[PDB]
């Protein structure tokens, strides 16, 4: 089993860590995807979303798509070797000229024939190979913008390729998120079964499409002259009780989706205290409590409201999640009791009767076990990024929350449903905000610890790899905690990635005060209007500041605050919205 979900996760790992242009990058794209000779690989890629919504692609359209993929891999392969021979004698004017034509030949082939992956009425099924190919096209355009003057191309030829890269990022992004959403809505229905297949689409295409799409902007090598590491803070969802049910509870799907928490700052799951109930010698997970900390463990634990019902047929069991790299895997045992319809006191049960919590770790640390283990295995839906090493080392996601979809009390109620919902954040969403020397640091604003009043966390547009922050008025956004590995004397610069339907002014303060409240203004920067009032959030509505003017922190676990300030003379009324996604920090 080498699923497309497997391949795509290892590719997410590659792009996230070793994003820097050179032979290592080309050799890497060959090894993970484009080295494959023949059709079967692309056949599997299409099959996954095809059987997901149970519509196969028309065969003429399907085979042309597969054969153009083959040709794309095939022209890239010859570019890649021509690239390597050049990097072995980089000044030779003949190797240069040989790479220059083999580049323009391969770019024209890929550029021109992506079309066959955007075919009308088959947009969703073709989405995952389109994401692969758009990502391949962008690798090439980054290459010329970065190596143009070494290769021998004119500065005018390169500036045109650069505009292609710009537009490519914006066009490809917008197509993918558009067909992601319309494919999602088409799967939605009102039943337990309809929600399962809805969520299956969301999860698989978040892994196979959106995560590669979130990294496209890093292909802009004029905007990112050096290394940069993005962070995927979005959470994908599993539910063993519902995903393993053979029937379907009717009209539930709207109730299930609401039981997921609303957009929120990123937290670190600390512990889960499970409560047990019983009925007729059948013991089950009836409710639980969740405790979390902010990013950086920057202060006091938050305890979530009770999930489910606080049973006592056994004593509570407190499972600590946050050991090593967190819980990477759950193996649950489901229990569906179907009696000969007695009722109320001979109940119908749709619940969990055990779960094993497996730790992500380079160690022998044993799993946590509630009652007993099971065979409903989350690793089957959230696979490893590296199958060459044991799962506890090559895992892709860490457990981030546990909610519950509840129905009935044990009371009356002929029927009881306790369906715990497991949230998975991608591994790249680090526990701390660490400012690296030597790279371009991305800190999504969802990594702060406090949202100030009148800033909302809004579900992200689809290409930021997480949620974002909105203000309707001017005011304070977040406070977040930063760690430097430099003397406090070291100087830094800062830029924003924002969306705004108005002009505004943005400031970053750096006097600490845990809780946030303090601060001294260190950075003052303008935000030009990026969209019209009431427009939708597409990639063209997002903009980068310049870098900021050197500043320094004033503590080494520092507490910085972001606020948006009224422009002088504007009269203190603000109309439109302000969106901030990311701040990025560099050195010197």
Numbering used by the authors: 53 to 640
Task: Quote the paper.
Two new chimeric Bacillus thuringiensis (Bt) proteins, Cry1A.2 and Cry1B.2, were constructed using specific domains, which provide insecticidal activity against key lepidopteran soybean pests while minimizing receptor overlaps between themselves, current, and soon to be commercialized plant incorporated protectants (PIP’s) in soybean. The two new chimeras adopt the well-conserved structure of 3 domain-Cry proteins. The high structural homology at the level of domain composition and folding supported the hypothesis that the two chimeras function in the same pore-formation mode-of-action as commercial Cry1 proteins such as Cry1Ab and the chimeric Cry1A.105 that maintain specificity to insects and have a long history of safe use (HOSU). Taken together, Cry1A.2 and Cry1B.2 represent two new proteins with toxicity against many key lepidopteran pests of soybean, with distinct binding preferences, that could be deployed with or without currently used insecticidal proteins in soybean.
